[PDB]
Design a protein around this ligand. Structure first.
Ligand SMILES: Cc1cc2nc3c(=O)[nH]c(=O)nc-3n(C[C@H](O)[C@H](O)[C@H](O)COP(=O)(O)OP(=O)(O)OC[C@H]3O[C@@H](n4cnc5c(N)ncnc54)[C@H](O)[C@@H]3O)c2cc1C
Ligand SMILES: Cc1cc2nc3c(=O)[nH]c(=O)nc-3n(C[C@H](O)[C@H](O)[C@H](O)COP(=O)(O)OP(=O)(O)OC[C@H]3O[C@@H](n4cnc5c(N)ncnc54)[C@H](O)[C@@H]3O)c2cc1C
Ligand SMILES: Nc1nc(=O)c2c([nH]1)NC[C@@H]1CN(c3ccc(C(=O)N[C@@H](CCC(=O)O)C(=O)O)cc3)CN21
Ligand SMILES: Nc1nc(=O)c2c([nH]1)NC[C@@H]1CN(c3ccc(C(=O)N[C@@H](CCC(=O)O)C(=O)O)cc3)CN21
Ligand SMILES: [Cl-]
Ligand SMILES: [Cl-]
Ligand SMILES: [Cl-]
Lengths: 500, 491
DNA sequence: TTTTT
DNA sequence: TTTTT
């Protein structure tokens, strides 16, 4: 396989810059004298989880409705407080570091287009109105978000701008999804409660829009005395962390488009994606696009166009389709977050299921700290805390284990994923947790995963567990799955099914 | 005949009062706001059938040099109810709607505009008009519930299909407190009304009503402004009010009733004392039918309350009218938070109980043959007038759910057919609340009869056979004097 | 019913 | 906890 730490993408920094230039050139708006800018005044572009220049409608609209743009990112102190119910760190060190890399790359890429990124630490509803006043901005453009916390910030910013006068308007633009909200065959209040019904409808009745093309010249900015430093984690009360084993994701749009190139074109792996996507070990088994999608470093419309080109130039098969099937799951949970609102975060979930659930700290800590006694579980939980990533197969398994085998309040698992995952997204995280916990609005199915069966089918040689739990390396297949207590450790709970 | 027009003003008195109200609130001139070169716009009316305090109308006017107002008679409005298939719009509300449209056209014409009336789906009508007239924009008020928001989607996509350029602009209205001014996003709306009320009263201001110029013209050149469709064309047999309150449709009549209730009769200052009554126009504002169609707005009502508090009296009753309008806002915002759970058997909380849909039981409730005078008189008033007292609505809801054990949506859908003031937010909001399937309650029929109809005058008015009887037997008559009871009382 | 003893 | 045995 290779026992080195695996950079994602694995491209050299010079390969990344070359691919980035070619990609930006391929999708560039071939000049635009037709767009009228003169006399349109100053605008502020407020970045959140859309840290890219490519295929960015908020940026396009800001540019087309102004003569001067002030791009701004606010490091919101609330991002580094604690989680809602159980008070874990709101943002763990690994995602914190990924965010900083995203910001460094965004500033660099904006500079290539005649702009810069203003960085400030503080609450957007305090920073943005002050900037709008100082620079005389007519508008603040930003992407629309869906969940409670984010929409509350939108309200506070809008009310803040109002409080300094009329004129300055907050303009929120839909983004994030492969299928556009406005193009759906239903309002989101009537979103089907079954995914298959949603997928069939959009596939039959909708089209995917082309990527928005962005000009190579986006300047000028206003005259700014201090563009601000990239913040450091220590200032935010977070101890920096470096990956010591496994995958080391690299933040930013440049690296993100680099990974699309790497996975699709250089390694030619898209043609077998459906075959390998239930793997757990290494970068090759799946796209690994999720951290870049969560921060908006890349966009699904861009990915879809790359898939289209791959299908023309190389091959179209069930694997080239399945990547889109999975991006449609991302769309679904995004839209479902609007339909469900805060019931997405409640114990009973969307259908308000009753009864039970332990919050035993000792049990939870054994799951969190990879000390359950089941190698399959512990390896996954160790991968998570070490790298900020876990395989899709692993996420499903550790969810079932915590809910069903341990009997724990599922929100303890969801909030720990919120702390740890580079790709943390409230819609996808709480969506999949409620789905896996059996508290979604989807019809009743008892989705119990057998740990022994999962180990045999998806880690048949014990390669995955041996990688993360190196004391198991010397053992053959069967002991890797079931090592026994002295070699490994005690089991904290019995298994509900598939032998105790 | 014992028929009471609401308001009790002649058509000419209504005109006089409306003129004075329009002039009081008129925007004094406005050459300042420039219009020239701004092109054609379409104003799409739905349940906002007024000129006063209309932000959709003002924005359409300020962003254009020419305005085409349109109302579409949507055929889906005259199909059937969702679960139990009663008429989607009953004859009495249908008649009220047509009167509102005639008045709106009149009031728009007096401002140099007109009203284009077409029968059909907005998503088919509006894009065609946009294209033919070269409209840059279609302005309309934003709605909150599934059916209305689906029409918004279909119109938007229909405009995209003719081309880019033509944009649908949806404006928040309807409420006393503005959505954008709330101290929380609607996803975090308090599940208890009292917390909502205390929050908005402490942290929000009520905006001044939007003032409208007296001259709004011109319109485009239009060949046929369209006739008002008859109820018979739409598959509804006309119905007249044969007894009780006869509400008069339109903004003019609505502003007339505000004048009548507040100023002519001076009743606002006792509103809280009288509001649990059931007989006659005097006991409450009776604003609801005009509010439901948007013939009047709560910001205008608040401005009239302020003036009354200055020119007449301020006390607990003058406040209480605002308290109740805040309930209207709450259910509107709750419709967004709850979505379609507002219409489901289990409600927002998804309660799992057991509920009969027995057709025989439901019909004795519907047709005022329960054998309980208080219940039957209220149900008769509803079917005869399209209105029922607030006190009555609470009682008949309690009776249907708890004494008869019926699926509450049967009663909610019957209200949807009959009520002049039908509003999905307020109706299904109040039914879920009353049925105990709300976000956060039994009525004793005998107690209610004694406390809110002591002399039996209400039941006697609607139930002719009780009129001869003394109050003792008006409360509890019996089989021979009235009829048998279809179910016993739970308590 | 995406992925599930 | 609008009105509530
Ligand atoms: C308990 C649990 C929690 C999860 N939390 C998150 C989360 O916080 N953020 C997140 O992005 N995904 C989450 N997922 C979904 C999924 O596991 C990850 O998106 C996936 O593992 C990322 O790896 P990849 O990019 O190589 O995925 P691929 O298999 O290559 O899929 C391609 C893309 O499709 C999307 N996708 C794939 N599967 C899902 C899915 N199950 N739900 C939604 N989108 C999907 C992602 O954008 C992903 O990048 C969660 C799943 C579970 C079971
Ligand atoms: C089962 C049930 C169903 C209802 N259905 C509707 C409906 O479809 N449409 C509707 O407008 N009202 C509905 N209501 C609320 C209320 O009964 C009526 O608004 C009221 O009777 C109208 O009479 P009024 O204008 O004279 O009220 P007033 O006592 O004079 O109150 C003034 C205004 O405040 C508002 N208001 C008062 N009470 C309520 C309330 N409980 N909920 C919301 N707003 C209120 C109304 O806009 C009303 O016009 C319902 C109540 C119940 C119990
Ligand atoms: N990025 C992100 N955005 C979020 O909105 C979010 C997360 N992450 N992670 C988990 C938290 C928890 N979420 C919650 C959980 C509960 C309520 C809630 O119950 N609110 C009440 C109203 C206010 C109150 O009384 O607390 C409700 O009735 O909905 C809201 C948001 C928001 N969640
Ligand atoms: N004016 C008005 N507007 C409405 O939206 C409305 C009324 N009146 N009167 C009652 C009906 C019933 N309402 C309903 C009831 C159920 C769903 C519903 O359950 N929809 C599904 C998705 C579509 C489906 O599967 O049927 C859902 O999951 O929410 C929607 C609207 C809309 N209601
Ligand atoms: Cl976008
Ligand atoms: Cl308005
Ligand atoms: Cl009467």
């Amino acid at each position: 396989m290779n026992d080195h730490i695996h950079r994602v993408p694995a491209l050299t920094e010079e390969e990344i810059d070359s691919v980035a230039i070619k990609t930006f050139e391929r999708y560039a708006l071939p000049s635009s004298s037709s767009v009228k800018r003169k006399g349109k005044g100053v605008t502020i572009l407020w970045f959140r989880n859309d840290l890219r220049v490519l295929d960015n409608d908020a940026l396009y609209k800001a540019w087309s409705s102004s003569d001067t743009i002030l791009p701004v990112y606010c490091l919101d102190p609330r991002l580094f407080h604690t989680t809602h119910f159980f008070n874990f760190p709101k943002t763990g060190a690994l995602r914190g570091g990924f965010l900083m890399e995203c910001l460094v790359d965004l500033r660099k890429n904006l500079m290539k287009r005649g702009l810069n990124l203003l960085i400030r630490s503080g609450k957007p509803e305090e920073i943005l109105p002050s900037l709008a006043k100082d620079f005389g901005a007519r508008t603040v453009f930003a992407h629309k978000e869906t969940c409670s916390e984010e929409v509350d910030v939108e309200r506070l910013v809008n009310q803040g701008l109002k409080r300094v006068g009329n004129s300055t308007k907050l303009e929120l633009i839909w983004g994030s999804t492969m299928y556009h909200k406005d193009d759906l065959p239903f309002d989101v209040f009537d979103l089907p409660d079954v995914y298959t019904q949603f997928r069939k409808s959009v596939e039959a009745k909708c089209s995917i829009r082309s990527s928005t093309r962005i000009p190579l010249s986006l300047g000028p900015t206003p005259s700014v005395d201090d563009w601000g430093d990239v913040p450091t984690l220590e200032k935010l009360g977070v101890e920096p962390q470096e990956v010591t084993r496994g995958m080391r994701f690299v933040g930013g749009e440049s690296a993100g488009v680099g990974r699309v190139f790497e996975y699709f074109w250089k390694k030619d792996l898209l043609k077998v994606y459906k075959e390998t996507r239930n793997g757990m070990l290494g970068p090759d088994y799946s796209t690994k696009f999720s951290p870049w999608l969560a921060f908006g470093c890349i966009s699904p419309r861009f990915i879809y166009e790359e898939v289209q080109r791959y299908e023309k130039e190389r091959v179209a098969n069930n694997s080239t389709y399945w990547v889109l099937f999975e991006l449609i799951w991302r769309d679904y949970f995004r839209f479902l977050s609007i339909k469900c609102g805060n019931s997405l975060f409640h114990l009973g979930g969307p259908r308000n299921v009753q009864g039970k659930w332990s919050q035993d700290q000792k049990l939870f800590e054994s799951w969190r700290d990879a000390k359950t006694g089941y190698p399959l579980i512990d390896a996954n939980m160790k991968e998570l805390s070490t790298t900020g990533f876990m395989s899709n197969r692993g996420r499903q398994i550790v969810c079932s284990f915590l809910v069903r085998d341990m009997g724990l309040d599922w929100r303890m698992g969801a909030e720990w994923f919120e702390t740890c995952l580079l790709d943390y997204d409230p819609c996808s995280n709480y969506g999949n947790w409620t789905y896996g916990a059996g508290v979604g609005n989807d019809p009743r199915e008892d989705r119990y995963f057998s740990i022994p069966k999962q180990a045999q089918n998806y880690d048949p040689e014990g390669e995955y567990v041996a990688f993360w739990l190196q004391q198991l390396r010397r053992l053959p297949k069967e002991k890797r799955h079931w090592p026994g207590r002295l070699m490994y450790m005690d089991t904290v709970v019995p298994l509900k099914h598939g032998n105790g």
